[PDB]
């Protein structure tokens, strides 16, 4: 006790614990098609469940990853022998950095080099693929456990936050600051932000505030708190999902949810944030922040709020005014739509809270089931509206926003060279950006390329119905299908499925993009 060590002695290191340490990344080494672990998305073959891992080198998401993830998720969703799906990343410091900023810059320059500034087919195809993947992630018809096991910059956190079993843990950073490079939230990020209490989502998107750990749970971005050690455990133990019924399996999934620490960074700031960010316009938000800074109050709370307001003003002065305005309009529109839906449904605050609580667990009562149905309908409507508005806003920003190009350039320069942290020097009507897009059909904004008409006769986002059961080449297995049509005898529309397969294909897209790049280079000559 005087000089010797004891287990109870603080600092007692356990040699066996130290020796048995493992590298977290090496848990997904046996996941590939060819076995070289180079594919963007890696799918592991397990009994009773699906496992998908994002394996981009930089953690970025591109069209190849989009197509791979789409196909994998559709196959797993249709497969009834896979009772649930798991989504994770193989990277060290990131879970998803979002869409590629270099690709965004390329699309912006391609759009703005043309005098008319038409929307290129590559840009529209990429954006529509993003929207469809986000909607699939939100509307998945199986228990989808998605872990934010790493930092999430840009808008990459939506793939997790939209899932049935969004989960966070220690080191689950969340830095959604799209306005830093003249860009807006996308892939349902605006919906996720607007679905938070008060103006917390708006504050996050505008100030680029980073919340990590149980902050996600307490803010409501991520439903559950589950350690990564469960994922191998789930892979190994998913064989009883087929021994129990569907609801029994869904409840069995909950054994892996843990209790998060009670610490909350913004516990004593939600009221202040709501007061300063419930305004109808960013100009009013700035005025309120300036007033709070200049309150000339020497009280403890007064000084704390003055310092916070000064910090918020400094963080907002360096962003893009147009991007901030567009993000504010989108998030406010989604929140207003939710408020209108609730008011027109005549549901009070207590009932709405009891309905929301049904999303964090499997309801064991009929009233809980009805509440969950109401929540499902409301969230479906809200996410569809948010996706449509986001597509419109992004398409118009790609065409008109030069601040987008400058912000992307500065972001890339800073990412590469540390000393290239120079901030761009920046230069509003909500309807101008949120109005319906003009299409070609036998509507006020930028024109879209005629080539788009083959895949997207309307550049307006719309939910495309999907089958939920496997398509067979055998007449009987086809007949038992629920989409089977006695008139034609086929389980789908081959003509539309041809276009769907073409749309979800990287060879055609990469050929189109390379041809567009060659034309863009020729634009240098002329």
């Amino acid at each position: 006790v005087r000089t010797g060590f004891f287990r109870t002695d603080p600092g007692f290191i356990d040699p066996e614990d130290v020796l048995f340490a493992e590298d977290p990344v090496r848990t997904w080494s046996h996941a590939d098609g060819g076995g070289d672990l180079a594919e963007e998305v890696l799918e592991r073959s397990n009994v009773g469940m699906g496992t998908c891992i994002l394996n981009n080198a930089s953690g970025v998401l591109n069209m190849k990853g989009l197509c791979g993830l789409f196909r994998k998720l559709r196959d797993l969703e249709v497969n009834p022998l896979k009772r649930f799906v798991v989504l994770t990343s193989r990277h060290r410091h990131f879970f998803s950095t979002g869409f590629d900023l270099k690709e965004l810059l390329f699309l912006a320059e391609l759009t703005q080099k043309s005098t008319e500034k038409t929307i290129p087919l590559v840009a529209l195809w990429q954006l529509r693929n993003l929207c469809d993947v986000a909607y699939l992630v939100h509307n998945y018809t199986k228990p989808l456990i998605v872990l934010m096991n790493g930092a999430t910059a840009g808008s990459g956190a939506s793939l997790c936050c939209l899932a049935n079993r969004s989960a966070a843990y220690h080191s689950s950073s969340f830095t959604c600051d799209p306005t830093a490079y003249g860009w807006i939230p996308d892939s349902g990020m605006s919906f996720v932000l607007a679905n938070l209490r008060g103006s917390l989502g708006v504050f996050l998107a505008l100030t680029g505030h980073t919340l990590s750990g149980p902050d996600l749970i307490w803010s409501g971005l991520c439903k559950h708190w589950i350690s990564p050690e469960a994922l191998p455990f789930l892979e190994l133990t998913a064989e009883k999902q087929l021994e129990v019924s569907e609801r029994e399996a869904a409840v069995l999934l909950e054994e892996h949810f843990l209790d998060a620490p009670d610490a909350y960074s913004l516990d004593d700031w939600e009221e202040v944030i709501h007061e300063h960010f419930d305004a109808p316009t960013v100009a009013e938000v700035r005025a309120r922040l300036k007033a709070t800074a200049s309150r000339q109050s020497t009280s403890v709370e007064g000084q704390l709020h003055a310092a916070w307001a000064r910090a918020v003003l400094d963080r907002l002065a360096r962003r893009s005014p147009l991007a901030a305005d567009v993000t504010f309009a989108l998030i406010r529109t989604v929140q207003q739509l939710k408020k209108q839906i609730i008011q027109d449904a005549g549901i009070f605050r207590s009932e709405w809270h009891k309905i929301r609580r049904t999303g964090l667990s499997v309801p064991f009562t009929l009233q809980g089931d009805c509440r969950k149905q109401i929540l499902e309908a409301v969230e479906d409507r809200l996410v569809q509206e948010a996706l449509q508005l986001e597509l419109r806003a992004a398409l118009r920003l790609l065409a008109w926003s030069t601040d987008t190009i400058d912000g992307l350039r500065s972001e890339c320069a800073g990412r590469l060279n540390p000393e290239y942290a120079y901030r761009p020097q920046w230069k509003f009507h909500k309807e101008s950006y949120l109005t319906p897009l003009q299409d070609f059909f036998p509507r006020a904004g930028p024109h879209i390329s005629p080539s788009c008409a083959y895949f997207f006769p309307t550049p307006e986002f719309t939910v495309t119905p999907r089958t939920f059961f496997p398509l067979s080449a055998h007449p009987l297995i086809r007949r038992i299908h629920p989409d089977f049509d006695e008139e034609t005898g086929n389980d789908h529309n081959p003509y539309a499925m041809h276009k769907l397969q073409m749309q979800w294909n990287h060879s055609l897209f990469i050929q189109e993009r390379m041809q567009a790049l060659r034309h863009f280079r020729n634009v240098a000559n002329v």
């Binding site: 070289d36 180079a38 990287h506 060879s507 990469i510 050929q511 390379m514």
Partner: protein, 556 residues
């Protein structure tokens, strides 16, 4: 603060010292042990004090004598300087050590003869070289007088006279010449080489031939003007024992036992080129010097390098028209195809056993193809810079010239690693579609493409040999060489490669140990210590490793 003490890493006293001369003579004694008893150290000190001023004439020792001595005389007490004692490691005292420019040369041990002492002093004076030496006739009288003061025979007088009259020797001359060569002392190297070449010293040819040849070569290379290729050719042929590896233009135009012993006869100084790094470095430097002409004009070469790109077909005719006669001759001049130490005695063999190339169709000379002309201009400039001393720029230009031929001119103008390297396990369609048009164009050298270089190990490539010679002439450890090699690997795009080779079979010839049946105990094959190929590792079989009482060094 004597350099001896600094090397010993301390401040131990050296009472001798209370433009440093090249040779320092250390007199190690132990007078501290016996102060009341004179012992032998005192007698030797008295003899030296009464001898040195007599041997060396000036129109322990007085300051005047110390200064007039041709060598730096320092005295040390091994019994009072523990650091210097361990540094010297003298088995016994009194002793006389000699250091030639901070390098141990000789040690006269205690109980030596008068003749040996005189030879030691004479050798020290010769190596070091107002000041004069006593005549060899009077050396005996001087020694006798010194002995009388400290306190002759017919044979002793003759021995002393002969020893003092002998001139410099092979060891002294070779050591001086080597040090001068390492110090790049042109005038020294010249004088020492002339003395060694002197006819009277021809008896020591077997010992001095290689050093003499390499001294001549170093002088020729270090001459301010660009080395004369014709002059270098003769020395290079002498050193290599042949001239089949030289460029064609520079090449000058019975009994059973005898025939079977002629096979093992080679007439080149290969021991020195395979053992002495200085010699191999000089050989590579000589190849680099041969790699350039002498009539080239600096301004014209610079302008032609600036204008030429290696592919510009709209400006190539103007370049070719404006090329001067001297520059055109230099471009057409022959240059080495392999390192001079490589492919000797069989470079004459003919090679026989592809695809579109960057080189012009039907091209057979430098001027036929624009690319080859730019490559040769850059080789000339790189060799000029290497001779001047601008190693960094020389390596840069040499790598650029080699890459112009190995890769495409555009891929070299990029001055960066390839964006995509096709042909690996997984090839991305983006790269496959951005592969450009100069995809099938492959080759190098100008006659043998890369597909021929891969197939034949004797194929030549002057651009490649330029870099190989520069690396050999600078050294692997050279920071410039390391930087250039890393740049070459990165730019060629072969960095990060991991070879994958299967193990060899565990089948071995002869079989397994067999002990003869019967009452002999003889091994029909192998012994009892034989390790079968299918055996665990030595570390696995001997987990403990050497015990604490085992011998670290197993050599007997």
């Amino acid at each position: 603060s004597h350099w001896l003490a600094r090397r010993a890493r301390g401040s131990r006293l050296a009472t001798g010292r209370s433009e440093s001369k090249p040779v320092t003579v250390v007199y190690a004694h132990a007078s501290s042990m016996e102060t009341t008893r004179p012992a032998s150290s005192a007698s030797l000190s008295r003899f030296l004090s009464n001898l040195l001023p007599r041997l060396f004439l000036f129109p322990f020792l007085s300051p005047s004598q110390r200064q007039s001595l041709p060598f730096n005389f320092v005295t040390v007490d091994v019994a009072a300087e523990p650091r210097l004692g361990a540094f010297l490691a003298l088995p016994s005292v009194p002793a006389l050590v000699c250091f030639y420019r901070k390098k141990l040369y000789s040690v006269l041990a205690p109980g030596a003869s008068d003749v040996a002492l005189l030879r030691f002093l004479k050798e020290a004076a010769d190596l070091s070289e107002v000041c004069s030496r006593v005549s060899p006739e009077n050396v005996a009288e001087a020694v006798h007088g010194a002995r009388v003061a400290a306190a002759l025979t017919e044979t002793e007088a003759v021995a002393l006279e002969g020893a003092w009259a002998e001139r410099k020797d092979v060891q002294c001359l070779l050591t001086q010449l080597g040090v001068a060569m390492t110090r790049e002392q042109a005038e020294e190297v010249q004088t020492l080489k002339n003395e060694l070449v002197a006819e009277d010293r021809s008896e020591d040819a077997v010992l001095t031939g290689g050093r003499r040849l390499f001294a001549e070569l170093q002088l020729q290379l270090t001459g301010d003007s660009p080395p004369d290729r014709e002059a270098l050719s003769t020395l290079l042929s002498d050193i290599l024992g042949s001239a089949l590896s030289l460029p064609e233009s520079l090449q000058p135009p019975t009994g059973y036992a005898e025939q079977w012993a002629s096979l093992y006869q080679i007439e080149g100084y290969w021991n020195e080129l395979e053992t002495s790094p200085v010699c191999a470095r000089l050989l590579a430097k000589a190849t680099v010097a041969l790699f350039d002409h002498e009539q080239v004009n600096l301004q014209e070469l610079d302008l032609c390098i600036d204008r030429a790109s290696g592919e510009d077909d709209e400006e190539w005719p103007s370049i070719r028209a404006s090329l001067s006669e001297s520059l055109k001759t230099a471009l057409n001049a022959d240059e080495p195809v392999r390192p001079l130490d490589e492919a000797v005695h069989y470079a004459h063999l003919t090679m026989k056993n592809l695809r579109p190339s960057f080189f012009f169709l039907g091209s057979t000379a430098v001027l036929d193809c624009p690319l080859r002309t730019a490559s040769r201009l850059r080789r000339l400039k790189a060799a000029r810079l290497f001779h001047g001393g601008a190693y960094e720029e020389a390596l840069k230009f040499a790598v650029f010239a080699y890459r112009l031929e190995c890769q495409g001119p555009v891929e070299t103008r990029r001055a960066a690693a390839p964006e995509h390297v096709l042909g690996k396990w997984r090839d991305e369609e983006a790269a496959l579609l951005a592969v450009d048009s100069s995809h099938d164009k492959v080759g190098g050298n100008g006659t043998e493409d890369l597909f021929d270089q891969m197939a034949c190990a004797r194929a030549g490539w002057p651009a490649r040999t330029l870099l190989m010679a520069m690396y050999m002439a600078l050294g692997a450890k050279h920071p410039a060489v390391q930087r250039s090699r890393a740049e070459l690997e990165v730019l060629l795009g072969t960095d990060g490669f991991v070879p994958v080779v299967f193990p060899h079979t565990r089948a071995r010839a002869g079989g397994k140990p067999i002990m003869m049946r019967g009452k002999s105990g003889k091994w029909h094959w192998l012994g009892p210590y034989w390790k079968p190929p299918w055996a665990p590792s030595n570390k696995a079989r001997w987990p403990t490793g050497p015990e604490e009482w085992a011998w670290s060094d197993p050599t007997r």
